[PDB]
Amino acid sequence: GSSGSSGELQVIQPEKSVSVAAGESATLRCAMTSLIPVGPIMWFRGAGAGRELIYNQKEGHFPRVTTVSELTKRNNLDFSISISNITPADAGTYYCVKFRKGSPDDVEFKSGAGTELSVRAKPSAPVVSGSGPSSG
């Protein structure tokens, strides 16, 4: 009849592990099974231990991070992000944490399984056969 919340929210992590190259743009897929309890989204690499803030929906000037989909819209479950200019020092495992709207600030509610990033060292030049046109 009149039901808005379907079950209990849950961090959906389709991409078990991403694959990119030093200097490429990674795609950390993420989506919740619901919007309740309401709350923003925050990424952290190494959840539980050594967790480093990757992105912050609430605020934060992150140029490298380009929201794959508009979050301003209404009822936007898709919370996937794209970190451009990937580095071999940022690799590891990004855990999509679903923070719940709270005061004075949000509060950790769910923790994504943890998407492992596979940063592939920069590429290399092709087999350089001397300097000159084909001979013999």
Side-chain angles (χ1 to χ4, degrees), residues 23-136:
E24 295 209 325
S25 65
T27 323
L28 305 169
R29 270 194 190 168
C30 181
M32 315 289 138
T33 77
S34 201
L35 298 166
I36 304 317
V38 74
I41 304 290
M42 284 180 212
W43 285 90
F44 296 96
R45 183 210 56 172
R51 70 214 91 175
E52 202 270 314
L53 182 58
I54 304 307
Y55 181 72
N56 175 223
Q57 188 151 327
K58 172 89 271 155
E59 51 158 290
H61 154 68
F62 289 96
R64 283 175 299 199
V65 188
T66 302
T67 51
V68 167
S69 306
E70 207 50 39
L71 307 171
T72 73
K73 302 184 297 187
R74 195 182 68 187
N75 313 335
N76 206 73
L77 288 171
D78 210 287
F79 288 116
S80 163
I81 50 157
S82 285
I83 306 171
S84 197
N85 209 118
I86 287 290
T87 52
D90 272 271
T93 324
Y94 296 62
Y95 304 85
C96 205
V97 173
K98 164 55 207 274
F99 269 77
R100 86 197 185 79
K101 204 191 203 287
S103 65
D105 83 293
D106 320 283
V107 168
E108 183 271 15
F109 175 84
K110 209 74 80 195
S111 182
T115 294
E116 174 200 31
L117 180 71
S118 201
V119 64
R120 286 185 174 286
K122 76 180 274 200
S124 58
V127 53
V128 160
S129 296
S131 189
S134 291
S135 280

